[PDB]
A paper describes a structure:
Major antigens on the iRBC surface include members of the P. falciparum erythrocyte membrane protein-1 (PfEMP1) family, highly polymorphic and modular proteins composed of DBL (Duffy binding-like) and CIDR (cysteine-rich interdomain region) domains. Adherence of iRBCs to uninfected RBC (known as rosetting) and adherence to the microvasculature (known as sequestration) are thought to be primary causes of morbidity, especially in cerebral and placental malaria. iRBCs adhere due to the binding of PfEMP1 to a variety of endothelial receptors among which are CD36, intercellular adhesion molecule-1 (ICAM-1), and chondroitin sulfate A (CSA). Further analysis of recombinant portions of the MC PfEMP1 molecule identified a 179-residue polypeptide, MC179 (residues 576 to 754), as a minimal portion of the MC CIDR1α domain that retained binding to CD36. We present the structure and analysis of MC179 in the context of the broad sequence diversity of the CIDR domains of the P. falciparum genomes and indicate the insights into overall DBL and PfEMP1 structure that MC179 provides.
MC179 is composed of a bundle of three helices connected by loops and three additional helices. The first helix (H1) of the bundle is joined to the second helix (H2) through a disordered fourteen-residue loop. At the end of the H2 helix there are seventy residues in three smaller helices, a, b, and c, that form the connection to the third helix (H3). The “V-shape” of MC179 is made up of the three-helix bundle and the three helices between the H2 and H3 helices, in the order H1-H2-a-b-c-H3. The H2 and H3 helices also make many contacts with each other and are linked by a conserved disulfide bond, Cys 49-Cys 159, that is observed in the electron density. We directly observed four of the seven cysteines and have evidence that six of the seven cysteines in MC179 are in disulfide bonds. We reasoned that one cysteine had reacted with cystamine (the oxidized form of cysteamine) during protein refolding, which implied that there was one free cysteine in MC179. From comparisons with DBL domains, we concluded that Cys 51 is the single unpaired cysteine in MC179 (see below). The three-helix bundle of MC179 structurally matched each DBL C-terminal three-helix bundle, a region that has also been named “subdomain 3”. In the MC179 crystal, pairs of molecules interact and bury 4300 Å2 of solvent accessible surface area between them.
Numbering used by the authors:
A (entry chain A), B (entry chain A): 2 to 29, 44 to 167
C-alpha cells in the first residue's frame, strides 16, 4: 500500500528520525532502556536501507527535463543569496537586502523547493549524514550495553 | 594587474553591490542625485558584464576532478540539513539537532564552501539575480529622471 509520495515521506522520515534520536539522548534499569534503543537503531537502519534501495531503483526514469534544469536555476539563486547572507552583515542588513530583492521581483531563499536534488543525488554518495548518525547511534548503544549490565 | 582571485573578488563585488543598492534607496536637488545614481547603475552593469565574460571564458578548464565531486557531496549534506532546518521545528529543536550531529561527527551547514558551484554554473543561466536587480535599478533611475526635472 502506497499511502503517500516517497518524496514527502522521505523528509518526514528523516525529520522524525532526528527528533527521535534527540529524545533518546534525554532518556539516557539503564539496560532495558538500552536494549530498546538498540532495537530502535536496528529498526531505523533497516528502514533507511530500504529508503536508499527505493531511491536507488527510481533513478532509471529519464523524465521531467525542464524540472531538473529549473532546479539548477533555483540552486544558483539560493546559493548566491545564502552565501552572501551567511558570510556578511547583521540581522538589519540581511533584512534590508531581502527587502531590496523582493522590491526588485526576486523571490527570497527557498531550499525546500530543491528537495528533489537531494533524493535524486544522495544515492550516488558513498556515505550519508543519516548513515553516519546511525553508526554513531549503534556505537552509543554498544557502549551502553557494555557498561550497564542489568539483565540478571 | 591581478590583485586577488576572481572567486574572492566576485563575492566581494556582489556583496558590495547589494549594500550600495540599499544605500541608494535611503538617499532617495533630487535630479543631480538621480543622474549620479543612473551613472552608477551603468557602471555596475558594465562591471557585471565583465564579471560574466570572465567566468564564461574560464569554463574551458577540465581541472580539479575530486573537488567538483567533493562539492556535490557537500551540497547533498547541506541541502538535507538546511531543508530540515527550514521546514521543521523551533530554535530549541534546530539547536538540539545541530548538537546531535556535531556529537556524531557531522559538520554543520556550510554553504560558503559551495561558492565554486555558483561561479561555475551562473554563466549557463539566461537571467541572474544581479541582472534582475540591475534592470530594476535602471527602471528606478528612469522613473526618477522622468518625475524629477531640475537641470535648468
Ligand atoms: Cl542567481
Ligand atoms: Cl547527506
Amino acid at each position: 500500500d502506497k499511502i503517500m509520495s516517497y518524496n514527502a515521506f522521505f523528509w518526514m522520515w528523516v525529520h522524525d528520525m532526528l527528533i527521535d534520536s534527540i529524545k533518546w539522548r534525554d532518556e539516557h534499569g539503564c539496560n532495558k532502556k538500552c536494549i530498546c534503543f538498540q532495537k530502535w537503531v536496528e529498526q531505523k537502519k533497516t528502514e533507511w536501507g530500504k529508503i536508499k534501495d527505493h531511491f536507488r531503483k527510481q533513478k532509471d526514469i529519464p523524465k521531467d527535463w525542464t524540472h531538473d534544469d529549473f532546479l539548477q536555476t533555483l540552486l544558483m539563486k539560493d546559493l548566491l543569496l545564502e552565501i552572501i547572507q551567511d558570510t556578511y552583515g547583521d540581522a538589519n542588513e540581511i533584512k534590508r537586502i531581502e527587502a531590496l530583492l523582493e522590491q526588485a521581483g526576486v523571490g527570497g531563499i527557498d531550499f525546500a523547493a530543491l528537495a528533489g536534488l537531494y533524493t535524486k543525488g544522495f544515492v550516488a554518495e558513498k556515505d550519508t549524514t543519516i548513515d553516519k548518525l546511525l553508526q554513531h547511534e549503534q556505537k552509543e548503544a554498544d557502549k551502553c550495553l557494555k557498561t550497564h549490565t542489568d539483565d540478571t
